[PDB]
Scaffold this active site. Structure first.
Site, PDB file in Angstrom:
ATOM      1  N   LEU A  77       0.826  -1.205   0.000  1.00 24.74           N
ATOM      2  CA  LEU A  77       0.000   0.000   0.000  1.00 24.74           C
ATOM      3  C   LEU A  77       0.861   1.256   0.000  1.00 24.74           C
ATOM      4  O   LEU A  77       0.526   2.246  -0.656  1.00 24.74           O
ATOM      5  CB  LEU A  77      -0.935   0.023   1.208  1.00 24.74           C
ATOM      6  N   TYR A  78       1.973   1.236   0.741  1.00 24.40           N
ATOM      7  CA  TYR A  78       2.902   2.360   0.733  1.00 24.40           C
ATOM      8  C   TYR A  78       3.331   2.696  -0.687  1.00 24.40           C
ATOM      9  O   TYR A  78       3.355   3.871  -1.084  1.00 24.40           O
ATOM     10  CB  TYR A  78       4.123   1.978   1.580  1.00 24.40           C
ATOM     11  N   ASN A  79       3.734   1.673  -1.462  1.00 27.61           N
ATOM     12  CA  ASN A  79       4.194   1.901  -2.830  1.00 27.61           C
ATOM     13  C   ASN A  79       3.052   2.409  -3.703  1.00 27.61           C
ATOM     14  O   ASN A  79       3.235   3.302  -4.536  1.00 27.61           O
ATOM     15  CB  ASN A  79       4.782   0.618  -3.422  1.00 27.61           C
TER      16      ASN A  79
END
Ligand SMILES: O=C(O)c1cccc(C#Cc2ccccc2)c1-n1cccc1
Lengths: 141, 134
Positions: A51-53
């Site tokens: 999700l960060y990416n």
């Protein structure tokens, strides 16, 4: 296409390129005169790193949107144990939200995310997305 | 043991008592909600704690932060990731009809208090495909 040192780009840059390619197919309205934040995409699951990416790449690809930080979801039925009341207990599943000015662009972005993550290995392909709607908008500061 | 959170819960319950709409469904899916923001970080936290006690049938996110909206003038606009000092939390619900009732109750509750509590905002929200909470 541009290639970083040693023949690779960071995952978030490749996400941005993938989103740009998919979104180029759709010439839908992304803004309104009123500029109100009435629509969104709610993105969750996968893993925190995936999700960060995705969050970083979404921001790079779409200047017209606004994003929350990563946070965590509560449980559904039968929450895990904890000292706080059930409704407050946090799972390990993460999420973020995208705010948008049009309902159609939320639909297009939801479908783009779905198409993009299906091309990635687990856990990225386990990311889930739904459009959302805000009845009175959100008055972002 | 937490009189502040319990007092907020009691105030919410009294407002919610005026409605008897269904809070759950046989499907059990999380399809609606209320999106609560503004005020201050602490006032939102306290409301979140009171909501959990008054509504066992809901689920709540932690507090988080809102990004910025549009900036007036010819630019620059904020980047999509920029975070403001304004916080929010989400209440997940199984029925839209109760989301509407809860929105009305929160508005009626917070307007009885001085700033910053009265500056808390709330809108109903809906999830086209639901959210599969784990
Ligand atoms: O702590 C806050 O800022 C806060 C946030 C949200 C709601 C309340 C309340 C209330 C209420 C409770 C019983 C009857 C009527 C109103 C609140 N609060 C509580 C004391 C002072 C402020």
């Amino acid at each position: 296409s541009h290639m970083g040192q040693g023949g690779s780009n960071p995952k978030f840059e490749n996400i941005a390129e993938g989103l740009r390619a998919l979104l180029a197919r759709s010439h839908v309205e992304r803004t309104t005169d009123e500029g109100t934040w009435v629509a969104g995409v709610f993105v969750y699951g996968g893993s925190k790193t995936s999700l960060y990416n995705l969050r970083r790449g979404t921001a790079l690809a779409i200047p017209q949107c606004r994003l929350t930080p990563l946070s965590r979801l509560p449980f559904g039925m039968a929450p895990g144990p904890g000292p706080q009341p059930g409704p407050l207990r946090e799972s390990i599943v993460c999420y973020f939200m995208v705010f948008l000015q049009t309902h159609i662009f939320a639909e297009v972005l939801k479908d783009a995310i779905k198409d993009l993550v299906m091309t990635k290995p687990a856990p990225t392909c386990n990311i889930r997305v739904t459009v959302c709607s805000f009845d009175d908008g959100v008055d972002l500061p």
